[PDB]
Amino acid sequence: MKYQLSATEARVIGCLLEKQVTTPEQYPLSVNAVTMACNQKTNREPVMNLGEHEVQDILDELVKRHYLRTVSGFGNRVTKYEQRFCNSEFGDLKLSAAEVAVITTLLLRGAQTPGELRTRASRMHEFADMQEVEQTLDGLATREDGPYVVRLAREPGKRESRYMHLFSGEV
């Protein structure tokens, strides 16, 4: 889009997108919740160990770039963070549940095959088949909205090709 996400910025975005679907009872996320989601040993490639201050800096960056938004009010005053990335009242980025699951999984685990994404994105959206994941990836690369996923050159002896998100540039 307008702002290209760094490796750590894409992880913070991917965490808030994932937790909004998987754990709605803990959304919006506090600073500790974002930090914990960033450094999870599971559903994360690569596994990170970002400090609380680093996460807050990334949170501050994505807020002023209008990808996140601060929520406070009262209730222990602990400031929470929502996603302005997709499907807000404001912005023009509209992503279906199938495309949210695909985008979030690649944001958190990097380049993956449709077979991989069929398993690792079901947590956020169960695809009835692999034709759904295939149709989801094909859509996000065709929208005049912009190319959101690229399909990398297929590996030798691989059998399936890998796809990568384009919120952090070209590979």
Least separation, in Å, of the C-beta of 55 and Cl ion?
A: 8
Of 1, 21, 39, 54, which one interacts with Cl ion (CB under 5 A)?
A: 54
Strand ranges in the chain using DSSP code E only, listed in sequence order: 29-30, 68-71, 80-83, 149-151, 163-165
Least separation, in Å, of the C-beta of 70 and Cl ion?
A: 20
Should residue 51 be labelled a site residue for Cl ion when binding is judged by CB under 5 A? yes
Q: Which of 57, 83, 79 is nearest to 68 (CA)?
A: 83
- Contact segment (CB under 5 A) with Cl ion among 40-48, 49-57, 65-73, 156-164 equals 49-57
User: Residue 112's beta-bridge partner residues?
Assistant: 163
Least separation, in Å, of the C-beta of 168 and Cl ion?
A: 21
- Contact segment (CB under 5 A) with Cl ion among 21-29, 46-54, 73-81, 96-104 equals 46-54
With beta carbons less than 8 A apart as the criterion, state whether 28 and 7 touch.
no
Reading the block at residue 125, the tokens are 């959206």
Binding site for Cl ion (CB under 5 A): 51, 53-54
